[PDB]
Design a protein around this ligand. Structure first.
Ligand code: CU
Ligand code: CU
Ligand code: CU
Ligand code: CU
Ligand code: CU
Ligand code: CU
Ligand code: CU
Ligand code: CU
Ligand code: CU
Lengths: 277, 277, 277
């Protein structure tokens, strides 16, 4: 049987930093000097509370704003609600999550589980346009009790005309072995719509990207249109039914793929070989 | 228990007008001199029939065309099918709705229930490009027997680079009290794709925007990409799990929010106060 | 009762050609001299294997690449994986499909069933930008055991600013009789997002476009946003609840419909008449 998420409800603490990078970009990190674009993955269980002690090490105001999770207005990360952070400053954001359940009126409250993201809200403009452009974005995953955990999680961010703020035609590339349970968090940012596509693999267009059984009528797809701040996620079995290979993923907007929005899902045999590579 | 829609099947009558407004815009209304942009909400139950006695008070041809509901070709609102209205003229459009049910061949006929809209089809071009641009659009809601009625319904229309044809950074703003059941009808028009986003709230990407219980695998989202003539809708509990606050909604295409596609969901305590506002 | 797909598992063989057309376009066909834009429909049952003996009759390199179905890397149709075809050359692509089922780890493997497409991957650019632009695309349908077969299937491809590579305002138009079970395969290609819309009809936004019964919470729609390489499909009962008529379909992006992305769903009485036509 596959590994599954346990019941949540833990209180968790975390240090996060905003850093200007030597190349001019901006990244979050869990450790000073180890910021990355995209930011590090934050993964919690429904019901967990997360207290992020955030330090802006930059010379400009910056913030943390999250999608999907519960937060009070004092943690929405906006200038308006006095929730950004001054240069050199520290603030504790609090993110909460909740489980689904029946309300008193008989309705069904949705849980927090899903594929989400965090990003800056005040660099460049009051909507973080400069922050996002420079790399201040990262993924968040909230797990429901009992759903399936992967062998590894990769984050693919279409940010304007870049993948993960990389130069055209520089990946990123990811590697797996035939049979691995691979998870993708797919996030879009900036100005343009895109269509995300994988060669040789497909997934369900629902909450987890996975069907639990035969009753789910969700479309099975390998192409999906996305816009700025959209986030979705899915799991695949690397090479399932198709074998080892250098499997392209790309934006399928023709000029975008032509201009470098391309990468490789490198699925290897156990000996490491990739047919045709 | 929450209030729910009853069984439909009523025959309803309605007067509607198209008016040029003093500012140059065009609006529909239920009363002469009270046209609005967006047009007034039309809400019916599955099975109801609606007879709209429509008068074009403008000096140009205009029409009414609806999405989703049943109508005969004589009510499709097009110049081609001789279904528009001459300046000063009156025409009765008929919209019908039906319930779901089993067909003789064993298949399942879908019902009309959903979040829909009406708009002009002949002002400026044979596709109403001028009518829509000037404000001739409005929302339609069709309820299925037994689904949940809100405390209030707000209509948010992304029309080209405007929200409800308003100037940049002029809202609209909406108000609620922590705990209200708030319904959003979200409609897109014009030339551009958008992504609709709410701070502090989320909904289900299905027909009603709501989960009935734990078996629904629909993604829970707070960001959604939309294109011209898309309509969807949802309900939220104002401030549920997040409290009172000035909660922004906006298009999340960065330049669009920077250029004014922003508004506030003002969720108040009972004393009317909004923390940080 | 309606006709339904049987269990699959047949091994099928097929000849396909790439041809330059006299007008300058490029089309696939099952017979030399009978290429079409879009390419011919390939329809199989889940579990079938398809061996396509493909001949490039053009003076440039070309390929076949499919979405959604199972294929080994040697059939992905890319220059990178040495899977394109030289001018005048022949290659056998193999497409496989599989049924859903329970994995050993308890998870649910999705089946291949869906609305898919094939297109060129090497004409003009390493992403087939020229091939797709010139007309090298076609639809694929994979049926699950037991789902509903239509009276006829039409393919509507939004390719850049054209429908099926046709000149503005030249259709295509399709015809039916009130009561026909009409299937639409809707595919998008090129550079631009679109919104596909039908007058007088609607469908479910799920895998088959159809609801099986009352438990499916999928949104019922008549407008849908699409991007390059998106494919979906649905069935409707021609004129159901609305009668005979010249029912427009179009992209609902206003300038796109104004510029000719329009066609007619001609639904006739048995005597062939169309009210208002
Ligand atoms: Cu925001
Ligand atoms: Cu792109
Ligand atoms: Cu955001
Ligand atoms: Cu129309
Ligand atoms: Cu926008
Ligand atoms: Cu319309
Ligand atoms: Cu490709
Ligand atoms: Cu279009
Ligand atoms: Cu492709």
């Amino acid at each position: 049987t596959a590994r599954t998420a346990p019941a949540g409800g833990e209180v968790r603490h975390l240090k996060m930093y905003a850093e200007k990078l030597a190349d001019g970009q901006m990244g979050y990190g869990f450790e000073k000097g180890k910021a990355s674009v995209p930011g590090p993955l934050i993964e919690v269980n429904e019901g967990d509370t997360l207290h992020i002690e955030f330090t802006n090490t930059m010379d400009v105001r910056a913030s943390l704003h999250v999608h999907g999770l519960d937060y009070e207005i004092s943690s929405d990360g906006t200038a308006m609600n006095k929730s950004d952070v001054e240069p050199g400053g520290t603030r504790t954001y609090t993110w909460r999550t909740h489980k689904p359940g029946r309300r008193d009126d008989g309705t069904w409250r949705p849980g927090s589980a899903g594929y989400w993201h965090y990003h800056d809200h005040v660099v460049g403009t009051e909507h973080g346009t400069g922050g996002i452009r420079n790399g201040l974005y990262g993924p968040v995953i909230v797990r429901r009790k009992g759903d399936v955990l992967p062998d590894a999680t990769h984050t693919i961010v279409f940010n304007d005309m870049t993948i993960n703020n990389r130069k055209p035609h520089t990946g990123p590339d990811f590697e797996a072995t035939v049979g691995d349970r691979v998870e993708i968090v797919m996030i879009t940012h900036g100005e343009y719509y895109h269509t995300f596509h994988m060669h040789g693999h497909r997934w369900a267009d629902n909450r987890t990207g996975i069907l639990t059984g035969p009753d789910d009528p969700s479309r099975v797809i390998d192409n999906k249109i996305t816009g700025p701040a959209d986030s979705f996620g899915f799991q695949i079995i690397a090479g399932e039914g198709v074998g080892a290979g250098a499997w392209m993923y790309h934006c399928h907007v023709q000029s975008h793929s032509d201009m470098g929005m391309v990468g490789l899902f490198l699925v290897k045999k156990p000996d490491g070989t990739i047919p045709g590579y």
